[PDB]
Structures are given as structure tokens and as C-alpha cells.
Design a protein around this ligand. Sequence first.
Ligand SMILES: CC(C)(COP(=O)(O)OP(=O)(O)OC[C@H]1O[C@@H](n2cnc3c(N)ncnc32)[C@@H](O)[C@@H]1OP(=O)(O)O)[C@@H](O)C(=O)NCCC(=O)NCCSCC(=O)Nc1ccn([C@@H]2O[C@H](CO)[C@H](O)[C@@H]2O)c(=O)n1
Ligand SMILES: CC(C)(COP(=O)(O)OP(=O)(O)OC[C@H]1O[C@@H](n2cnc3c(N)ncnc32)[C@@H](O)[C@@H]1OP(=O)(O)O)[C@@H](O)C(=O)NCCC(=O)NCCSCC(=O)Nc1ccn([C@@H]2O[C@H](CO)[C@H](O)[C@@H]2O)c(=O)n1
Ligand SMILES: Nc1ncnc2c1ncn2[C@@H]1O[C@H](COP(=O)(O)OP(=O)(O)O)[C@@H](O)[C@H]1O
Ligand SMILES: Nc1ncnc2c1ncn2[C@@H]1O[C@H](COP(=O)(O)OP(=O)(O)O)[C@@H](O)[C@H]1O
Lengths: 821, 821
Amino acid sequence: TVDSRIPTLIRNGLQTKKRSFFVVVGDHAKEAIVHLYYIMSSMDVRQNKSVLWAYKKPFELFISLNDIRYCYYKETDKILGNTYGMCILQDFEAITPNILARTIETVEGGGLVVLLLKGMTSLKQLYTMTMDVHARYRTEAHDDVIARFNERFLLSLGSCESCLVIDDELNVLPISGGKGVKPLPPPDEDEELSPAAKELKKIKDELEDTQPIGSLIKLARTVDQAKALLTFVDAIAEKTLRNTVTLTAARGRGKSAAMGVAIAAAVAYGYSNIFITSPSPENLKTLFEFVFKGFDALDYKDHADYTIIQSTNPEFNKAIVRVNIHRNHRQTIQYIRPQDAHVLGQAELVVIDEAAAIPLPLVKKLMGPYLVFMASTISGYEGTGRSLSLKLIKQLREQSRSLKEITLSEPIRYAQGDNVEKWLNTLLCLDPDPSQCELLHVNRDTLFSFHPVSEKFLQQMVALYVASHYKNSPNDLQLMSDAPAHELFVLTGPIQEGRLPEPLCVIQVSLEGKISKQSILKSLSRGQQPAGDLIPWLVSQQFQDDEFASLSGARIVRIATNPDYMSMGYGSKALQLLVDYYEGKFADIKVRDMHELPPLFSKLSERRPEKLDYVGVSYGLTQQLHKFWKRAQFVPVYLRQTANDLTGEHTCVMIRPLQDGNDPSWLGAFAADFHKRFLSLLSYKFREFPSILALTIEESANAGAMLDPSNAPTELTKAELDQLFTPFDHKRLESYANGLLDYHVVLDLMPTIAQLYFTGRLREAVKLSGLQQAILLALGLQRKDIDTLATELNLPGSQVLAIFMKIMRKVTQHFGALVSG
Amino acid sequence: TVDSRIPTLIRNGLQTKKRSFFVVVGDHAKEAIVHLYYIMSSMDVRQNKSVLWAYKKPFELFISLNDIRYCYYKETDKILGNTYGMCILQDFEAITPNILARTIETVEGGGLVVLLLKGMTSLKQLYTMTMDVHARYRTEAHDDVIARFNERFLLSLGSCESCLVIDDELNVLPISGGKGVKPLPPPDEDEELSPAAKELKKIKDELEDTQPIGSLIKLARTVDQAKALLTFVDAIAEKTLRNTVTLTAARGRGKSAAMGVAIAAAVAYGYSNIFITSPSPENLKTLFEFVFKGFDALDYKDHADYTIIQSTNPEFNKAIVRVNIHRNHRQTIQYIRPQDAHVLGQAELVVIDEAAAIPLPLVKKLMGPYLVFMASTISGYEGTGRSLSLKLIKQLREQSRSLKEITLSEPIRYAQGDNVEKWLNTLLCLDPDPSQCELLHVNRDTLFSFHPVSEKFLQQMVALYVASHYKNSPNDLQLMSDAPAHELFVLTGPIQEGRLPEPLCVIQVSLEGKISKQSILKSLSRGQQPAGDLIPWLVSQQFQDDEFASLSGARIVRIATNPDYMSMGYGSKALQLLVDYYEGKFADIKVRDMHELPPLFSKLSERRPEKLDYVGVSYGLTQQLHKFWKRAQFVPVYLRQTANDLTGEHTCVMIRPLQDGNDPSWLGAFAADFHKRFLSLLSYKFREFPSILALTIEESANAGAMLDPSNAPTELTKAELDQLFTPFDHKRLESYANGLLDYHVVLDLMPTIAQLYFTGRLREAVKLSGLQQAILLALGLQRKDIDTLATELNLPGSQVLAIFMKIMRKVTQHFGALVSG
Ligand SMILES: CC(C)(COP(=O)(O)OP(=O)(O)OC[C@H]1O[C@@H](n2cnc3c(N)ncnc32)[C@@H](O)[C@@H]1OP(=O)(O)O)[C@@H](O)C(=O)NCCC(=O)NCCSCC(=O)Nc1ccn([C@@H]2O[C@H](CO)[C@H](O)[C@@H]2O)c(=O)n1
Ligand SMILES: CC(C)(COP(=O)(O)OP(=O)(O)OC[C@H]1O[C@@H](n2cnc3c(N)ncnc32)[C@@H](O)[C@@H]1OP(=O)(O)O)[C@@H](O)C(=O)NCCC(=O)NCCSCC(=O)Nc1ccn([C@@H]2O[C@H](CO)[C@H](O)[C@@H]2O)c(=O)n1
Ligand SMILES: Nc1ncnc2c1ncn2[C@@H]1O[C@H](COP(=O)(O)OP(=O)(O)O)[C@@H](O)[C@H]1O
Ligand SMILES: Nc1ncnc2c1ncn2[C@@H]1O[C@H](COP(=O)(O)OP(=O)(O)O)[C@@H](O)[C@H]1O
């Protein structure tokens, strides 16, 4: 006698085409799943689909009757863009937030989601379970890890109306939030149909006569997708290259699939040069899948009218790089990286999938005097921050000849308003004068306790620091929840009682350091790296130092303010409060844990700070971001040569010696060493730096070198000048300074003069303005051509020569005076 | 009573459609020309065309009745691709060989060519005329200039059968070679027509039905041009991109015009991406002229089916850069420079006009997996050497899927076998064991005396040294003929009597130097440059030296061997003979000058050489050419940073101190100064040099610095090493040498280590192989990326790191031993 709730929930999910959720507890879950599949199959025959099964590393007879796909947790990326009738998760030890999102969105509506839990006497042991991720965050300085994600995961099962926590012998648990589910009325679909379906049938048959719309539009499944297809084709049909269509929606809405049909329409419309740009070739798996689907709807013949060129040479062997069409005249569909903007000088259509993830300058150069298609993801898994989307939307409007924007709401695989989708979005959190503001430390125990007040703030703070991420990674939530030493700080204004304060800025601080001299020397003699810390474990390796790792410090993992209050002062003010705080300036029912709840908003005054020596931040170098860090008295110590592939910017590490009463000389050695490294390294992979940006780093690094008085530079004597330049070199300089010689001859002297000036030897003798320093820096250490410098400075080439010659007569006169005197 | 020869010659030229030549002598030539035009017009009405007139800086009534175009001698390039019924040259002072060719080829068949000569008592004063060109060759060391081109010009008038040296009062001179011209038989063209015309009419009407050939083929004027059109279109019609058509002919044959119709055919055939590459946009004036002519034959409508985009922004405002076609789908015709090979990744047709003038590597990268059209000029004005054409033809055959070659012979504007064309080609000369060979000095007085034996050798030697010129410049003949100090040397084998020796190698040596210390200081204090000499006038300016210009030397203006005997030894052997020779090791009838003729083949033994200090050569740097010069014991002194636009290579100057018994130390200072300049300048515009090529220059320059013993480098002491690297830098080096650190960290030390090695400080301490030196040179002084180095060396990137790490453990151990010891 099976319980009647399981058949009731299964029928409810199938009738409305919304996913159902189940969790099995026990060591004999094989009996449960086969009974679950029996109920699902005995009530409907349209669900005999693939049963996705994921593990890290009778039932025997039944597994040989239905299609089962076994996919590894690390290999779950291969099932992207697919559809399965049931998702199964077996090993709890490896279901990260990223994996949970990936294996859930690939389930069709009306299916089942079943999660396998190992044999348990009671469910109270799940909150303290070990994982495969706390093993990452273990450090010798901070080892103990408190598991909080499992606490939130088990408490959130009650907030899902389609979740049934089933048992080994088919029994329901009180923690399940769907125990009170009532059966739906019997379906009546013989004549009555959903209004969206009637609207979808209306638009399909209305344009059936017209071609190529009549054949392509049958591929659409939603009204929102269909309206995008007409919007795309309408731009194509005008045969005018002054259009631009921007599409934004969530993940799983069909923007990429609708993008492919738009491209297939353009091919049939007589378009020769078609280009696709995307952050990764992986994102084009579905886009190129529906181009062929659209081609099949157009009755194109394989190996006769089109060919598929697969770029199997690189690691992404499955990626499609080019498709050639030779029906009447040779038409082509080429996939290029966003950086390759030179090929687009002859194009007619550019499709930019996931344009939000592309850096804004790349999109700016990608768009030209042709037709551009754009798609973006604003919510859901792998979403984008609201700030970058706003920047992209505003930028396109400035360029506007015609721009049209559309949106998609209804999903494809599951009905809108899905219960499991809402539960997962909530679980992963996918979607005043500064002087009066005060910083508050957020207690992580109450924050992730799934309390209604706690949950509301968690959504606000999560959306605060993911508002600028190029891609939304849910694994960061696992990081904050289960970190051993990460502390969360929020800056709020003066807020009255009864109203939760609005987070104006969120700072995540990780405690780093306390490295024993044995541990550093053990691994500095090898190539292995625990990578528990970043700032102490990099400066020690980069500088081959032994004392810095022994210090104790903090790493600013993430700092973000509200996008509405940007450039107002709520970020710098939070940093100063955080800096002063570390300076010691402030002296089987499983209900939510109502007890053991400390004040969520524990003020900094009532908590004693730790004794810290420095604060460090590792961040992607940008001119605006660097200016903010330098304002907070940070000095660079490191700057990675290999620019990040996704963003195109170099990682920069800054360290501030916040502790007062301590020697500011251990950092003076680090800043000086980097400063002398930067000058010589300005020609290796730093040649692409703008002159102004590279100058600012040099000034900041030089300022940091002044923390140590022993690093003060000495003047240049006459004896040193003679050792550096032969009399032939001097006579060349005098003639050029008089305007009697071309500048090309005196060009080998750039490294000598520029190094002398920027190392401080010539800095006090001759004073140069901001513009002259930038030209000398580029010509001397970046080895930039004059024409390249003229373009970058937005100045004529002759004017650059005039400024450069001004630099010489200042240097030439001092050199002559030094030798003569 | 006018003489009957002028009407007879005019009728002869008109009937056969060959140009006629006249020369007028006197101060009242206006009476002669108007009588000449009267005879021309009174006998035919199809000659009332434009009368081109060129000057540097009644008749009044008659000039207002006919079209006259006045063009400046320097501005004669604007009449390129035009057609005129009569060419007039007035000022003898500026009719250079280049100008003479330019103003002659633009005359239609049957027209007149009249050259105006100022009033003369006798013609004997023409041989000694000053010009506007000898003013260039005047030098303070060598001032007197003997005019020989005018001597050859006046003697060659007798070798032209259509040249009548007319007088002021219509009288003929004995020097004229057409005084015995007999009248042609009366024409019979009512029914009888030339066989070429019948063949031309046959091919036009045969393909009249077929389109787009039927309309385009009417543009052809010769059978050879027509056969090219069918050859071009046949490649287009196959719709297969595995074809390549190479066209070679003389200048004025119609290769460019036939190229345009081929492009217009491709547009009508459904070709979207069409690209044109040429050395200069000027060469495309006629090609783009006939594309529109072909478009008009296709009845394309301006501003409705095609648009003309003119690149007026640069200096070549008349150049057409792009043409867009939007009849059915957007088709385009884009003009790109040969260097821009990245855009061709999507193309369907590439037209390479004047492919011979393009460097071979550029053509190699221009051709890809598409259809390529090629045209070249092999003879006539602005021709190309036989060596480069052979290199291009062979290279294409190696790449062969299908290749077809065609040729054109019959001209367009004038009938084949034109008398004036043959006279001009002759006038401008447009078209054994080495141990047994001996060098011979060619006497310039007899060489340019127009003697039948002398003329035959002149054609062989001219074709010898223009066999490698990218473009054929006839002004060089004016240089050799009227130079004040240039001496011509030819190397011949042992040849029996009665047979003129075959020139195996020709060397043109210009005597340079003897600059007073006042003259150098006068202009070294200013920016003006007489530019009479090159090697003494550049080393003095580049090095700010005062003694080198006072020396006496020789410049090897041009050295070329027979293309059949290349890489055999006839060039190096001639150089050694020339070097030893300067070392003093060898103790109104105007007939051709039969008297005053020295031995044309005066041996070096019977002529006393001049006391010389050095021999210098200015040449375009190539790896093969540099190896030959270094073998002859030459050392570089200069290397221009700005690569030549046409060829893409940098000018290099080498100097050899051939004089024995003299101090080889004045050059040791020059070579050492360049060697220290090259190391620092390897990052400014020399970054494009291959590692092997840049290494060879460094070795050669370093070897030259050894001529001065005082320039020998000293060893590196322990004190110097500590001054260069801080203990942090040393500890970084030890860790990397052990394989305990990434190579990116130890990268700022490249300029320090590479400079130390290549300056000689570390050269004797540590020995590096040829491959290791090249990697260290590029990574240290060229700042090349590893991936760039891996591609250039045709080696995997990991292997480059392995070799680079080998370089360190040699340097690291010496540094440790130096400090420890
Ligand atoms: C706005 C803000 C800076 C200050 O906020 P404020 O508004 O409060 O500025 P304030 O008024 O105080 O001073 C005024 C002065 O600030 C300046 N300023 C004004 N506006 C801007 C501006 N828009 N940008 C910059 N500077 C600005 C200046 O212009 C002005 O000078 P001015 O005064 O006269 O005008 C800060 O709060 C904020 O939200 N930044 C956005 C989030 C962020 O990135 N924070 C830094 C994180 S570091 C550790 C870290 O994790 N790094 C990473 C990052 C990514 N990745 C990977 O890449 C992927 C995603 O990228 C992937 O996810 C992965 O993660 C990674 O691996 N590691
Ligand atoms: C062939 C030749 C070198 C030796 O002749 P050989 O056959 O005899 O060589 P040999 O047997 O003695 O030694 C064997 C060794 O020679 C080597 N070697 C073997 N074959 C080659 C090879 N094909 N090329 C190179 N090196 C080779 C080596 O590979 C082998 O080593 P290996 O041994 O084991 O194998 C010489 O004779 C010759 O024709 N060179 C062609 C004409 C030329 O350019 N001469 C130099 C002129 S400099 C002053 C000057 O005016 N410069 C310019 C030039 C242009 N421009 C502007 O650019 C426009 C036009 O460009 C425009 O017109 C304007 O003018 C300008 O402004 N200024
Ligand atoms: N018109 C359609 N017809 C059928 N399936 C579709 C359609 N549109 C989307 N899908 C489903 O959605 C998946 C594609 O993901 P999609 O939502 O297009 O990515 P994105 O979120 O980038 O738009 C495919 O696996 C497919 O099953
Ligand atoms: N098919 C043609 N019809 C008329 N004129 C032509 C034709 N072909 C060549 N010409 C004449 O030749 C000139 C073009 O020079 P051309 O010989 O094509 O240059 P290239 O020597 O590079 O082929 C034009 O001025 C034109 O008058």
C-alpha cells in the first residue's frame, strides 16, 4: 500500500507541465526509484525519456529497460543544451551549487527530480557533513570549517511546494514542504487549450504563406520566442545595414535557439558575410544546433548545399568554427573571437551571443556600419550583473541608426512559474550622507539559517556583489557559507527600528597569513602550492621572501556598492571603517533554528578585532579601479603578465600596512623591488598598457618605495653620466636638442634616459609634467612608435615630437651642466 | 613649296597606324608645327585629338582652334593612361629618360611626335649641353660633368626610320634617319582588312549570344587581349576556387584593362568578396577605369546598382579604394595593400596587378584557397627584371590546384612593330671557371658613342643590372651616361679575338669623399644636405664625426651577375678584383665619332688606381645579401629604422678598410658605436627582424669592433655583478635555474643578461651555441613572446623554454661562481 501523495504530486506535475522534486533517504533507495518510475510510467506514456544520473566515482532488471545516461560531476558540462525526463543525483559529497544548477535546468516539464541520500538514522547529521569543497578551504592557519550550506539546503525543502522528502519504504518526512499538496482537477484538453498555445498557433499559421518565415516559424515553442523571430527577420528583410537588435532574458528562455533561426533566415535572404562572436565556443552549441535545424526546415541538403567545418584542432574539438553555403553564390557563417575586429570590415551581419559577458570596449569595436544581433542573459544560472547590462544598453543607445530591444519570459523546457525553478533560484540566490553611515558585521550563522528576515537580507547582499560579475557563479555562495575564516561586512546608514537596513556596500574579508617558516620553505623548495592563501603565498613565491608569509593579514575578497549609489562614497567609507576596525579603533521535524542565533547585525564595537599587519587585495587591473585602491593608500606588489583571457586585464595585488606603531619598511622593500621590475617589464606583455595607465602604476609603486627611507634614490654624479654615455652619444644629444638632427638617430638612448628618470636618479634634477612623463615612459620603457603614441594621445604626430624634444632639452641641459660643473 | 618628305612620312604613319617622329631646330618653331598640323589635318580628319604639350616653366590664332593640354615635366604622371594625337616637347633642359618614356607611350598610332630644339647655328653644341640633371651630380670633390646622353640621343636619330629632323623653314638634316623614306602604296581598305581585325571580329560575334561575355568582349581591341578575357572568365565560370591565372606582357599591352573586364565579369557571375592588391594605387587608374567601362557594358546604373568610394583622405585623392554593388545581394570590390593578408580569409577573388613588383613573400601570403588573378610587366617602360619574374613563376608552380599562364604581344595605341617604340626601347635600353676570369674597366666615352659594337654591349650590361630591379627606371641610364666620377667595371672570362666577351658581372663604382672640414662643419650645423655622396655624408651625420668625411672612398652603386650563373662565384670574384685594384695591386652631317675612341676594354693593369681609404655600399638588407657582403669583409655602420615602403626592408651601409698599411682603427670606433646602438635599437622597429638575421648582424658588427684593440671588452668582476642585481634578483635566478619557478617571473632580467652577453662582458666567461644565442637575443633585445619565437623557429613552445632554461643554468652558475670566488 503506497502512500497516495506520490501519485498525486506526479499527476500534478505532469498535468501542468511543471517539474516535481523528491529526496530519498536510506541505503536501499533502489526500491524507491523503481516504484517512482512505475507510478510515472503507469500514468503517462510520454515520459519514457532519458534518465540523467550523476555520480562522482528488481533494480538490476529495471535499469536494462529504460535509457540511462551516467555523467560525472566534473563532466556535467557535456549535457549542456540537452533534455532529460528525470534527473538523479546520488553522491551528496559533490553536488556543488554550480552542479545543482546545471543538472536541474536540463529537465523537461512534468518530469521528476530525485536526490539520493545515504542511509541515516536521523537527519540531524546532514548539517555537519563533510564535503569535497571544505577540503579546499582548509588552511594551516585556519583549519576548522563549519558547514552551513547543508543547513540551508535542508531547511529550504519546506519552502518548495513540489518537494517530497520520501523515505526508503515510501514514507514522507515533516521537513517536506509538499506534504499538504491537494490533487488538481482532472484535465480537460480535448477542446480547451491554453491561451498561449492558441496564440502560438495563430502566429504560425498567419505567416505560413510567407517564406522563409513559414518553414522557420514552426521551430518556435513560445510566443516570446516567436516575437523575437519576427523582430530579427524584420531587420533582415529591410536589406538595410543600419539596424541593431538587442535581446535580454534569463537562461533557458531560448535566446540562443531563436538566434540560430534568425541566422538561417539571413542565409535564405541572400546574406554572404555572416559572423558570430561569443565569449566561448561552448555557448554556441545550441546556436549552431538550431542553425542546422533551421536549415533542415529550409530543406537544405547536407554535403550538397552546406558544409560543417569543425575546429577539432584546439581543445574544443566539438566546437563548430565555420559553415559554408554554396547554393547560388558562396555564403558563409564564420565564428570569430571578439578580439578579431579586423575581419568585420566586409561583413553584413554580426551575431554577438552573450554580449554582456564580452567586455564593453570589445563590443564597441565589434559594432560597425552593418547589421548587428545581440543576446544577453540577465537572470538565472550563469547570469550577468545589472551594472554591466546597464552599461551595454546605454552604450548602444549613444551609438544610435535604428535600435530595437525585446525580451523573453516564458521558459522552454518547463512551464512558467515552475516550483523547482523558484526553489533553486531562491536557494542559490540567483535572483544618505556617508558620514552618517556605519559599518556592520554580519553573523554567518544567522545569515544562512533560512529565517524569513535573514533570507531577505541574503538576497540583497548576494545581488549586491554579483551586480558586476561577468558570469554568475553560484559556487561563491558555497564559499561564503562554508568558509573557515571569511568575514562579511556591510555598510548601512542610520536606519530606524522595524526596518531592515539597505546594504549600501558589502565587503568580504578573508583572514590570511600565519604561515610557519617550515611550511613556506617546504613548498618554496618545490613546485607544489596549497593555494589556501593568495597574497602571502604569492609575495613569498614572487619575491623569494621568508618573513612576509609569517605575517598575519586580511584579503578583501570582494567589495561592491549599490549600483544606484556608485561614485558617491559608500565604498571608500566602508574601506576606511574596515581599516580602522582592524587598527583597534573600536574598543523527524527539522525546523529553522530559532535558538542559538547571535545578533545578525553585531556592531564592530562589541567584537574585538584580530591583530593584523596588512590588508591585501587581488583584482583585475582597470584605470578606474586602480585609482580607488590608490586613494585608500594601497601600493602594488605584483602584476601578472598573462592577461586574463575572459576579461583581457592583468591581475594586480596591492598591500597596505594598516597596523600603526609597526615598521613600514618590510613593504618598502617589496614596492621598490616591483618598481624596478615594472620598468624593465613594461616591454614584455605590458606594451599594450596605455601611457597614462602605466604611468599611474609607476607613480604609485614609487610612492610605496618611499615607505623605506633606505630606498631613497641618490643624485646622478658626473662620473656616473660619463660611464653611461660615450662622447659620441653626448654629441648626438646636443645636436638633436638644437633641432639639427632627426629624432630616429637618438632612439637607442631611450632605455638609459627613461630608466634614469623613473628610478629617481634624475627625478629631482629635472621636473617633468604629467604629459611629458607619459610620452617618455612609453618611448623609453614601452618602446611605442610615435604614430601609435599619437593615436593613443589623440594628438598629431608632430605635436608628440615637439613634446619629446621638450623632454630632451631639459635632460640635455642638465647633462651638460653636470659634466661642465 | 614645302618639301615632299613630310607629307610622305605623315601619310605612311597614318596608313599603317605607326607613330611618326619629328625634331624641329630653330627659334621660330611655331611656323613649323602649324605647317605640320596643316599637313596632318588636310589629309585625315580622324586626327583632331588632344595635342599634349610639355614645358618646365599665325600661331596665336591656330592654338585657339585645337585642343592643347599643357603638362609640367614633374606633373607628367597625371597623363598616365591617356591618349593624345600629338606629343610636343619644348624644353630640352628637363626631358629625362623617365619623362621621355612617359610622354611617348601616350600617343595613339598614326600621330606625330615633335621635339622642339632652341635656335642653333650648328648642332655640334648639343653634345656639351648642361641639363637640369648634371646640377645634381656636381660635387665639391668631383665637379666637372661630361654630357654623353645628348651625344647618344642625337646619334640615335639616324637609326629611326620614321624620324625626320626638320628645320625652321621646313628643311631636312642629314642626321635624320628617314630622309630616304619611300611613299607607301595607296590603301585598299574598302573590302580588304587586316587579318588580325578579321580574327577580332570573329571572336566577338562568336560569343555574342553568351552573357555576360557578349557585352564585355566588345571592349577588347586585340586578339591577345580577347584571349585573356576568355581565359579569365573561364576560370570564373567554373565556380571553383582552385584556379590561378598569371598574365605577363610589356607595358602598353592592355593587361590592366583586360583585368578590369575580368573583374566586371566576376561581379555579374555572382561574386561577393573581390579584392585588388597592387604596389601603388596609381597602377589601378586604368584597372578601375575599365571596371566601370565593363559595368557600363553590363548596363549597370550609377547611384542605383553600384557606388564609387574614393579615398580622398590620403595624398592619393584620385585613387579609388572601394566599389560596392547592391543589385541582388551586396557585392563589393575592395582595394587593399599587399600587407593586409588577414582580410582575405573570407574572399573569393584576389587580383594582384603588377605582381612582379610585389615582394615574393607578400605574394606567397596573398594567395590562399580561392581564385587568384595575377598580372606582371616584363619589358618596356617600368618593367621588371627577369630574375624576379622567374622567381614568381617558379613559386606559383610549386604551390600547384590549377595554374594557367597567358601572354600579350600586340600593343593597344600603336601598331605592332612601331618605329618610334623600337627607337625608344633601343635608346633607353629597355629591352667559365672564376679563376680564369679577369676584370675589365669599360670606357664610358666609347660605350655611349652609339657604335654598333658599343651599342650591343650596352644592351647586355644594362639588362645585366636591371635584371633584379623591382621597377625599371630609365633615369639610371642618365646617371651612368652623365656621372662625373662613376666608373663601370665588368668581369669577363678568357675570350678569343673577334667575339665580344659576355658580361658575367657588372659593378658600378662611384668615387666619394674628399670633403673639406669647412664644408662638413658648415652643413653639420644646419639641416641642409647636398647629398652628392651617401656613405661619407651619412656616417658624418649619424656619428657626428669630422674625420671620416675627409677620407677618400668608393661606393658600390650596383653589382649584379648574370642570372644564369648565380651563386657560382662571378660576383665575389669581381669584388676581390675590384678591391685589389684599388689596393694598387695592378701596376650638317653628324656621324658617329670614329676617332677619339679609347680602348673600350682598357685592362686594369694599364690604368693607375686612385689612392682610396675605404669601400662602402648602401643596400637593402636581406639575409642572403648580407651574407655575401660579410664574406667580402664588410662591416655594417648604419641600418635605417624606417623600412622601405616598396620593398619592406631596411637600408644597410657597410664599409671596408681595403687600404693596407693604414690604421684599421677609425672604422673600429664606428663599428663598435653601431654595435652598442643595435643592441638597444633592436626593440624600435627592429622587433620584426628574425632572430637568426638579427644575430648575424650583431656578430658582424661585433667582429668589426675588433679592428680596434682598444674596443676589446673586459671581464665582469664580482663587484660589477652585485651592482647590477640585488640579492632578491639573485635568489630569483637560483630558484628558476633549479626549475622551481615559472619563467615569467624572471623576465625583467632579460635586458641585463642579454646586454652583458652581447657586449662582450660575459661572452668569454660563458659560451653559447648558435641556437641559444638567437633565443637569448630575441628574448633579451627584441622582447619577443615565446609563442612568437616558437613559430619563427618552427619549434614547440616547450622546447623554446627548455633551451632558454639551458641558457640560464650556464649564466646562473657563472654568476654564482663569480660571487663565491
Ligand atoms: C565602484 C567601486 C570600485 C567603488 O565604489 P564607490 O562608488 O563607493 O567609489 P567612491 O565613491 O568611494 O570613490 C570614487 C572613485 O572610485 C572609482 N570608481 C568609481 N566608479 C568605478 C567603477 N565603476 N569601477 C572602478 N572604479 C570606480 C573612481 O573612478 C572614483 O574616483 P573619482 O572620485 O573622482 O571619480 C566598488 O565599490 C565596486 O562596486 N566595484 C564593482 C565590483 C568590483 O569589481 N570591485 C572590485 C573587486 S576587488 C577583489 C576581486 O575580487 N577582483 C576580481 C574581480 C573579478 N574577477 C573575475 O572577473 C569576473 C567578473 O568580473 C569573475 O566574476 C571573476 O570574479 C576576479 O577573479 N577578481
Ligand atoms: C646575387 C649577388 C648577391 C651575388 O652574386 P654571386 O652569384 O656571384 O654570389 P657568389 O657566388 O659570389 O657567393 C654566394 C653567396 O652570395 C649570396 N647570394 C647568392 N644568391 C643571392 C641572391 N639571389 N641574393 C642575395 N645574396 C645571394 C649567398 O646566398 C651566397 O652564399 P653561399 O655560398 O653558400 O650560398 C649579386 O651579384 C646580385 O646579382 N644581386 C642582385 C642585384 C642586387 O640587388 N645587388 C646588390 C645591390 S647593392 C647596392 C644597391 O644599389 N642596393 C639597392 C637595391 C635596390 N634598391 C631599390 O630597390 C628597387 C629594386 O630592388 C629599386 O630598383 C631601387 O634600386 C636600392 O635603392 N638600393
Ligand atoms: N524553438 C525551440 N524548439 C525546441 N527546443 C528549444 C527551442 N528553443 C529552446 N529550446 C530548448 O532550449 C535549449 C537551448 O537553450 P536556450 O534557452 O536556447 O539557451 P539560451 O538561454 O542561451 O537562449 C535546447 O536544448 C532546446 O531543447
Ligand atoms: N580594350 C581596350 N579598349 C580601349 N582602350 C584600351 C583597351 N586596352 C587598353 N587600352 C588603352 O591602354 C591604356 C591602359 O593601359 P594598359 O596597357 O592597360 O596598362 P598595362 O600596361 O598595365 O596593361 C588605356 O589608356 C587605354 O586607352
